[PDB]
Design an enzyme around this catalytic site. Structure first.
Site, PDB file in Angstrom:
ATOM      1  CB  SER A  11      -1.504   4.145  -4.677  1.00 10.20           C
ATOM      2  OG  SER A  11      -2.476   4.851  -3.592  1.00 10.20           O
ATOM      3  CG  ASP A  18      -2.075   7.266  -0.469  1.00 14.43           C
ATOM      4  OD1 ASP A  18      -0.937   7.530  -0.648  1.00 14.43           O
ATOM      5  OD2 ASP A  18      -3.903   7.594  -0.521  1.00 14.43           O
ATOM      6  CG  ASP A  51      -1.501   1.132   1.451  1.00 16.09           C
ATOM      7  OD1 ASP A  51      -2.394   1.640   0.565  1.00 16.09           O
ATOM      8  OD2 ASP A  51      -1.692   1.563   2.970  1.00 16.09           O
ATOM      9  CB  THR A  62      -8.802  -1.574   1.973  1.00 19.34           C
ATOM     10  OG1 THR A  62      -7.701  -0.820   1.530  1.00 19.34           O
ATOM     11  CG2 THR A  62      -9.977  -0.608   2.016  1.00 19.34           C
TER      12      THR A  62
HETATM   13 MG   LIG Z   1      -3.135   3.324   3.060  1.00 21.54          MG
END
Ligand SMILES: [Mg+2]
EC number: 3.1.3.3
Length: 221
Positions: free
Chosen positions: A105, A18, A16, A178
């Site tokens: 992302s 962010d 991931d 997520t």
């Molecule tokens: Mg994240």
């Protein structure tokens, strides 16, 4: 050590972006550059998990931002996202053992390719949303066919990678629900809390770290 045994059995690792590979959320930083930080940062928190459908939440945030190509360029040039401590060394060690490293992302390829091209990750290994611009640079929308434009998109990316390359053992690494929900189809998940701890991930993930050094607890070279 059991964590390191797992980590060293992987032939592909998906990160991931962010709040994992970078300290910030790219869409929030873009909103800052464009002057709508408060509203967008709140909507980003609002969309966490499967809370609201991702494509709708993305459309609404971009409708407030309306980022021009020049504004995206200025973000990359003048306010580039900060890499999380340890991620350069970790990606370097993974690549030195020929582990295939990917970035996934819900942010934007313009920014994520800049991040990947600080980590020697080829653009082929980046999966992110794609902003559209008119000839004059004005915001024109985003590519709604990308798997990262939909809820569950990270798992869809990992499924595509399994079908294309037949990896034996793919690990997903990320801070949020997520990311946790992308295993399956990933073979394992490591939660990451070095930037902000999402307690529901920390409480339920089998594997959880707060500093990328912990995976660099091997032989340290
Ligand atoms: Mg994240």
């Amino acid at each position: 050590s059991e964590l390191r045994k797992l980590f060293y059995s992987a032939d592909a690792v998906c990160f991931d972006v962010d709040s994992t590979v970078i300290r910030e959320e790219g869409i929030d930083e873009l909103a800052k550059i464009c002057g709508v930080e408060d509203a967008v940062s709140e909507m980003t928190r609002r969309a966490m998990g499967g809370a609201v459908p991702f494509k709708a939440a993305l459309t609404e945030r971009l409708a407030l931002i309306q980022p021009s190509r020049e504004q995206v360029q200025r973000l990359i040039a003048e306010q580039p996202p900060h890499l999380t401590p340890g991620i350069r060394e970790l990606v370097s060690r993974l690549q030195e053992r020929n582990v295939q490293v990917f970035l996934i992302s819900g942010g934007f390829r313009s920014i994520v390719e800049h991040v990947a091209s600080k980590l020697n990750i080829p653009a082929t290994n980046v999966f992110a949303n794609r902003l559209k611009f008119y000839f004059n640079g004005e915001y024109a929308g985003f590519d709604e066919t990308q798997p990262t434009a939909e809820s569950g998109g990270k798992g869809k990316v990992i499924k595509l990678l399994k079908e294309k390359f037949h990896f034996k053992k793919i690990i997903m690494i990320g801070d949020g629900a997520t990311d946790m929900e992308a295993c399956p189809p990933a073979d394992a998940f490591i939660g990451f809390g070095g930037n902000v701890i999402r307690q529901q991930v920390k409480d339920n993930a089998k594997w959880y770290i707060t500093d990328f050094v912990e995976l660099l607890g091997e032989l340290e070279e």
